[PDB]
Tab-separated table of C-alpha atoms and ligand atoms in Angstrom:
chain	number	residue	atom	x	y	z
A	1	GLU	CA	86.074	112.012	148.375
A	2	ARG	CA	87.549	114.723	145.758
A	3	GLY	CA	90.533	112.684	145.375
A	4	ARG	CA	88.572	109.968	144.073
A	5	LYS	CA	86.293	111.984	142.235
A	6	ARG	CA	89.284	113.296	140.074
A	7	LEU	CA	90.387	109.992	139.475
A	8	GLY	CA	86.922	109.047	138.300
A	9	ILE	CA	86.828	111.620	135.745
A	10	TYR	CA	90.289	110.432	134.186
A	11	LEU	CA	88.677	106.995	133.990
A	12	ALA	CA	85.487	108.270	132.620
A	13	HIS	CA	87.658	109.645	130.067
A	14	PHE	CA	89.733	106.737	129.181
A	15	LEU	CA	86.325	104.658	128.806
A	16	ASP	CA	85.308	107.606	126.291
A	17	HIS	CA	88.657	106.728	124.534
A	18	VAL	CA	88.098	102.776	124.494
A	19	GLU	CA	84.294	103.217	123.431
A	20	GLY	CA	85.240	105.847	120.696
A	21	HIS	CA	88.346	103.923	119.610
A	22	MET	CA	86.087	101.226	118.896
A	23	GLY	CA	83.816	103.067	116.847
A	24	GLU	CA	86.593	104.470	114.707
A	25	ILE	CA	87.878	100.943	113.904
A	26	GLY	CA	84.120	100.313	113.062
A	27	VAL	CA	84.284	103.433	110.625
A	28	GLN	CA	87.624	103.141	109.386
A	29	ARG	CA	87.557	99.381	108.494
A	30	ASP	CA	85.751	98.496	105.377
A	31	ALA	CA	88.386	100.743	103.202
A	32	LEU	CA	91.195	98.318	104.856
A	33	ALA	CA	90.307	95.571	102.114
A	34	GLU	CA	91.737	93.328	104.851
A	35	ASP	CA	92.654	89.599	104.359
A	36	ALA	CA	91.726	87.122	107.008
A	37	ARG	CA	95.309	87.788	109.028
A	38	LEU	CA	94.772	91.425	109.407
A	39	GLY	CA	90.817	90.651	110.610
A	40	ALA	CA	91.852	88.110	112.890
A	41	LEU	CA	94.361	90.743	114.452
A	42	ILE	CA	91.576	93.765	114.493
A	43	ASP	CA	89.004	91.356	115.780
A	44	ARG	CA	91.534	90.482	118.399
A	45	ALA	CA	92.349	94.211	119.199
A	46	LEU	CA	88.532	95.046	119.333
A	47	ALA	CA	88.093	92.094	121.779
A	48	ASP	CA	90.858	93.260	124.133
A	49	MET	CA	89.270	96.449	123.822
A	50	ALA	CA	86.147	94.945	125.088
A	51	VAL	CA	87.710	93.662	127.941
A	52	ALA	CA	89.195	96.733	129.133
A	53	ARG	CA	85.640	98.504	128.843
A	54	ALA	CA	84.641	96.013	130.853
A	55	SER	CA	86.843	96.461	133.713
A	56	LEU	CA	86.724	100.353	133.346
A	57	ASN	CA	83.049	99.984	134.013
A	58	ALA	CA	83.292	98.028	136.698
A	59	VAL	CA	85.583	100.869	138.358
A	60	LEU	CA	82.957	103.372	137.351
A	61	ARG	CA	80.441	101.302	138.888
A	62	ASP	CA	82.028	101.032	142.464
A	63	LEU	CA	82.949	104.709	142.373
B	1	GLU	CA	89.172	105.198	99.214
B	2	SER	CA	91.639	102.703	97.915
B	3	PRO	CA	93.163	100.248	100.552
B	4	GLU	CA	96.444	101.977	100.234
B	5	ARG	CA	95.020	105.587	101.690
B	6	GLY	CA	92.660	104.023	104.246
B	7	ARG	CA	95.435	102.076	105.599
B	8	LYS	CA	97.980	104.982	105.866
B	9	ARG	CA	95.141	107.389	107.456
B	10	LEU	CA	94.591	104.698	109.889
B	11	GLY	CA	97.902	103.895	110.804
B	12	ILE	CA	98.236	107.595	111.528
B	13	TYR	CA	95.268	107.570	113.946
B	14	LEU	CA	96.747	104.474	115.730
B	15	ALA	CA	99.590	105.877	116.710
B	16	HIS	CA	98.488	108.768	117.673
B	17	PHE	CA	95.937	107.399	119.852
B	18	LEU	CA	98.771	104.715	121.203
B	19	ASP	CA	100.879	107.760	122.384
B	20	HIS	CA	97.735	109.341	123.455
B	21	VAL	CA	96.423	106.700	125.877
B	22	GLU	CA	99.649	105.792	127.151
B	23	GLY	CA	99.825	109.601	128.864
B	24	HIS	CA	96.422	108.347	130.412
B	25	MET	CA	97.572	104.884	131.420
B	26	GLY	CA	100.675	106.609	133.146
B	27	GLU	CA	98.810	109.522	134.971
B	28	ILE	CA	96.048	107.217	136.156
B	29	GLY	CA	98.782	105.014	137.459
B	30	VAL	CA	100.150	107.655	139.511
B	31	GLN	CA	96.895	108.871	141.019
B	32	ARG	CA	96.235	105.232	141.714
B	33	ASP	CA	99.210	105.099	143.597
B	34	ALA	CA	98.200	108.033	145.930
B	35	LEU	CA	95.272	105.729	147.167
B	36	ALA	CA	94.880	103.824	150.513
B	37	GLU	CA	96.910	100.918	151.041
B	38	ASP	CA	95.252	97.921	149.215
B	39	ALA	CA	92.117	99.940	148.859
B	40	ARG	CA	89.640	97.957	146.809
B	41	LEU	CA	89.175	100.915	144.443
B	42	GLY	CA	92.975	100.157	143.684
B	43	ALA	CA	92.471	96.563	142.555
B	44	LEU	CA	89.813	97.140	140.449
B	45	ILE	CA	92.162	100.228	138.873
B	46	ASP	CA	95.130	97.891	138.464
B	47	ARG	CA	93.234	95.454	136.728
B	48	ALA	CA	91.879	98.210	133.692
B	49	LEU	CA	95.337	99.432	133.661
B	50	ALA	CA	96.602	95.860	133.062
B	51	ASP	CA	93.757	95.103	130.463
B	52	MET	CA	94.518	98.215	128.466
B	53	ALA	CA	98.507	96.921	128.337
B	54	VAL	CA	96.624	93.770	126.595
B	55	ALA	CA	94.829	96.350	124.253
B	56	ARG	CA	97.992	97.948	123.458
B	57	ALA	CA	99.819	95.058	122.614
B	58	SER	CA	97.092	93.921	120.383
B	59	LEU	CA	96.532	97.252	118.735
B	60	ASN	CA	100.124	97.275	117.939
B	61	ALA	CA	100.160	94.244	116.195
B	62	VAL	CA	97.198	95.680	113.617
B	63	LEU	CA	99.263	98.893	113.612
B	64	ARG	CA	102.375	96.431	112.046
B	65	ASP	CA	100.261	94.416	109.734
B	66	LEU	CA	99.063	97.465	107.681
C	1	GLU	CA	76.081	105.767	95.780
C	2	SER	CA	72.650	104.821	95.742
C	3	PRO	CA	70.659	107.564	98.408
C	4	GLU	CA	69.521	105.063	100.757
C	5	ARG	CA	72.984	103.621	101.388
C	6	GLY	CA	74.206	107.259	101.664
C	7	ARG	CA	72.041	108.081	104.354
C	8	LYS	CA	72.985	105.154	106.301
C	9	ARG	CA	76.730	106.140	105.751
C	10	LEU	CA	76.080	109.711	106.923
C	11	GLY	CA	74.188	108.285	110.290
C	12	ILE	CA	77.420	106.466	110.851
C	13	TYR	CA	79.523	109.375	110.489
C	14	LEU	CA	77.078	111.459	112.416
C	15	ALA	CA	77.195	108.896	115.534
C	16	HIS	CA	80.702	108.667	115.170
C	17	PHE	CA	81.312	112.499	115.594
C	18	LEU	CA	78.977	112.762	118.407
C	19	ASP	CA	81.274	110.248	120.283
C	20	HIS	CA	84.340	112.488	119.127
C	21	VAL	CA	82.139	115.593	120.598
C	22	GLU	CA	82.168	113.554	124.200
C	23	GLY	CA	85.730	112.390	123.951
C	24	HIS	CA	86.720	116.005	123.290
C	25	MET	CA	85.049	117.991	125.745
C	26	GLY	CA	86.276	115.365	128.500
C	27	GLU	CA	89.888	115.756	126.918
C	28	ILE	CA	89.580	119.566	127.276
C	29	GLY	CA	88.579	119.120	131.014
C	30	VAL	CA	91.043	116.791	132.141
C	31	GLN	CA	93.798	118.441	130.527
C	32	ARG	CA	92.759	121.932	131.603
C	33	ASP	CA	94.106	121.866	135.004
C	34	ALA	CA	97.510	120.946	134.166
C	35	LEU	CA	97.584	124.258	131.962
C	36	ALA	CA	97.979	126.878	134.832
C	37	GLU	CA	95.547	128.858	132.395
C	38	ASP	CA	95.980	132.848	132.470
C	39	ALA	CA	92.520	134.272	132.199
C	40	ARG	CA	93.087	135.064	128.377
C	41	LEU	CA	93.924	131.357	127.408
C	42	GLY	CA	90.850	130.372	129.984
C	43	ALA	CA	88.658	132.292	128.290
C	44	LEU	CA	89.509	130.987	124.463
C	45	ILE	CA	88.847	127.651	126.112
C	46	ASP	CA	85.468	128.235	127.438
C	47	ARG	CA	85.136	129.897	123.929
C	48	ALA	CA	85.844	126.577	121.899
C	49	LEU	CA	83.983	124.456	124.560
C	50	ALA	CA	80.774	126.576	123.969
C	51	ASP	CA	81.344	126.555	120.134
C	52	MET	CA	81.756	122.593	120.404
C	53	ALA	CA	78.406	122.601	122.658
C	54	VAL	CA	76.781	124.593	119.653
C	55	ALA	CA	78.085	122.031	117.020
C	56	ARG	CA	76.693	119.089	118.712
C	57	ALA	CA	73.563	120.651	118.936
C	58	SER	CA	73.475	120.895	115.247
C	59	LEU	CA	74.933	117.856	114.342
C	60	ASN	CA	72.158	116.007	116.921
C	61	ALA	CA	69.482	117.978	114.379
C	62	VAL	CA	70.740	116.092	111.507
C	63	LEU	CA	70.727	112.895	113.167
C	64	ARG	CA	67.263	113.471	114.244
C	65	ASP	CA	66.206	114.567	110.698
C	66	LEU	CA	68.074	111.518	109.169
D	1	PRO	CA	103.042	122.500	134.284
D	2	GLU	CA	104.238	124.343	131.105
D	3	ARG	CA	104.764	120.827	129.798
D	4	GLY	CA	100.756	120.578	130.292
D	5	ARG	CA	100.759	123.242	127.158
D	6	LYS	CA	103.030	120.946	124.917
D	7	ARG	CA	101.095	117.940	125.350
D	8	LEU	CA	97.549	119.735	124.741
D	9	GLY	CA	98.781	121.318	121.796
D	10	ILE	CA	99.826	118.122	120.350
D	11	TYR	CA	96.275	116.790	121.097
D	12	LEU	CA	94.539	119.755	119.251
D	13	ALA	CA	97.045	119.625	116.294
D	14	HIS	CA	96.374	115.554	115.860
D	15	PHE	CA	92.479	116.285	116.635
D	16	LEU	CA	91.834	119.144	114.133
D	17	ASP	CA	93.617	117.070	111.211
D	18	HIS	CA	91.346	114.214	112.288
D	19	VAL	CA	87.940	116.109	112.611
D	20	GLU	CA	89.053	117.872	109.105
D	21	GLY	CA	88.997	114.614	107.373
D	22	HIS	CA	85.297	113.784	108.981
D	23	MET	CA	83.924	116.940	108.022
D	24	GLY	CA	85.101	116.311	104.337
D	25	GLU	CA	83.016	112.551	104.603
D	26	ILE	CA	80.080	114.479	105.902
D	27	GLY	CA	80.393	117.153	102.991
D	28	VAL	CA	80.869	114.389	100.554
D	29	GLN	CA	77.408	112.816	101.714
D	30	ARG	CA	75.663	116.197	101.741
D	31	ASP	CA	76.624	116.740	98.252
D	32	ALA	CA	75.385	113.100	97.118
D	33	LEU	CA	72.166	113.582	99.376
D	34	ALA	CA	71.652	116.811	97.651
D	35	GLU	CA	67.846	116.287	96.321
D	36	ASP	CA	66.780	116.533	99.820
D	37	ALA	CA	67.262	120.097	100.315
D	38	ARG	CA	66.040	120.363	104.207
D	39	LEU	CA	68.523	117.861	105.109
D	40	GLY	CA	71.151	119.642	103.143
D	41	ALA	CA	70.343	122.439	105.173
D	42	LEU	CA	70.341	120.883	108.444
D	43	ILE	CA	74.043	119.864	107.171
D	44	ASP	CA	75.353	122.975	105.962
D	45	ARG	CA	74.469	124.618	109.352
D	46	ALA	CA	76.052	121.730	111.447
D	47	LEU	CA	79.410	122.264	109.005
D	48	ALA	CA	79.354	125.886	109.855
D	49	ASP	CA	79.040	125.344	113.124
D	50	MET	CA	82.018	122.972	113.047
D	51	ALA	CA	83.626	125.544	111.352
D	52	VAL	CA	83.458	128.171	113.917
D	53	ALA	CA	84.326	125.328	116.854
D	54	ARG	CA	87.521	124.594	114.400
D	55	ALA	CA	88.599	128.198	114.832
D	56	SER	CA	88.019	128.785	118.205
D	57	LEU	CA	90.253	125.257	119.024
D	58	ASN	CA	92.977	126.810	116.578
D	59	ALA	CA	92.784	130.023	118.725
D	60	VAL	CA	93.287	127.609	121.929
D	61	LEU	CA	96.245	126.195	119.979
D	62	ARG	CA	98.047	129.107	119.030
D	63	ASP	CA	97.861	130.657	122.510
D	64	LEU	CA	99.161	127.686	123.972
E	1	CA	CA1	81.717	109.662	129.234
E	2	CL	CL1	96.028	92.677	101.654
E	3	CL	CL1	98.407	91.009	103.792
E	4	CL	CL1	101.567	88.667	104.535
E	5	NI	NI1	87.011	109.574	114.017
E	6	NI	NI1	92.438	111.663	126.330
């Protein structure tokens, strides 16, 4: 369906934002000189990205 | 770069990014509402959007801790 | 500052900016239809995309070599 | 409709500032890595191609 196709392209692009943003954090992280608390939050944000990435992959898998 | 400038530049990227993806969440939400009633695709999409709301909360906490 | 550590750094920069290309091409593709582009704006956009595509291939060529 | 040009222009503005920072970083590594001529040349082409890409995107931005 073309409506489903358009939706798929938006989600594909959103997945690109998820993965790309996870790469951004990885690139910027060292220059932050994080303590244990900022690190915990960054890791928590990153794990939440990975869940969202998983759900987006499920959607892209099924159509 | 010193940690000061690092957190500054990342703080900037994070705010733009949160603003940006909130636009896509709203867009995809409205397109998703045009789907058939109780279409299984819709449920997969709501879960993805919900998980993004979690990520927004947690990324905001990062932003505030810089 | 040691040469092997800079080549690793550069590899990370390059893989990352390749993610920026993918994100950006996608960005133009989705936001474009909302533009109601005239042909002139439509021509610049196609031009920027083609230029970005040349850039991706010249970034790959660096990453292939190291 | 025409609000779709204000949204795209905010994107491109942020994007080009963000890209500018990555070209600087790459430029820094090209300099440190100057002893490898061949790789430096590859990097120069790539940075020049991005320079052209950044100008065409800036053109889009102005025309929005
Ligand atoms: Ca993609
Ligand atoms: Cl600290
Ligand atoms: Cl602290
Ligand atoms: Cl503290
Ligand atoms: Ni980046
Ligand atoms: Ni986007």
